[PDB]
Amino acid sequence: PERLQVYKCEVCGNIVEVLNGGIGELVCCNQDMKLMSENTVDAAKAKHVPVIEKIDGGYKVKVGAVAHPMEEKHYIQWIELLADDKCYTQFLKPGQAPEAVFLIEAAKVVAREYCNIHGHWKAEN
Template identity: 55%
Template sequence: MTKKLEVYKCNICGNIVIVMHPGVGTLVCCGKPMQLLEEKTKDVGMEKHVPVVEKTDKGIKVKVGSISHPMVNEHYIEWIEISKDEDEVYIKFLKPGMNPEAKFEGIEKVDKARGYCNIHGLWSYKQ
């Protein structure tokens, strides 16, 4: 059974799915079950992966890592997501060469922030 906002990855083609509507079946891609990604919060390298949430005059700014994460073709943050609850979620997509951060204007408070590293997976910070 899937849960709302869980993140799954295909280990064959790399397809990533965020569950919008939970179901009882198994998510399948390329003929194989998809892997549920664990939300890491601490580990070796957390200083470059755990989202850091800052309140600004205009809203919320999320930086991935207290030490700036690399943003090169081979290793970068693909997306940053914030949520107030499971019914209000915002995502910004990043590309190599960009700063590993996202600004969400008009948002005053978040309960959770997540970032996805193309090498080291899914990382989260919860208030």
């Protein structure tokens, strides 16, 4: 595992993010945890690829070009903004907007979002 990677435990539901890398394989509920690699799922990019907008003092992230659903059974669980050595995470729940604002001083950033159904997605400016 490498820092910032997101792993999911099939069946049991746990989802973790790596803070410190290592060689060991993460296991849960009798199987290796699944690496949720960004932009690998066969789903509409229009609703899943994060859109980054530069604002005063930071960035505004929307998921996505077309607003993604935020329903009890299908929503964006969180949005993250990655920069230099920073990982800012904004958790979301059904009924909220698929959007997040991050105040940071970084010219180059990477935005990520995780959909409970369609996986992990990212975009950069």
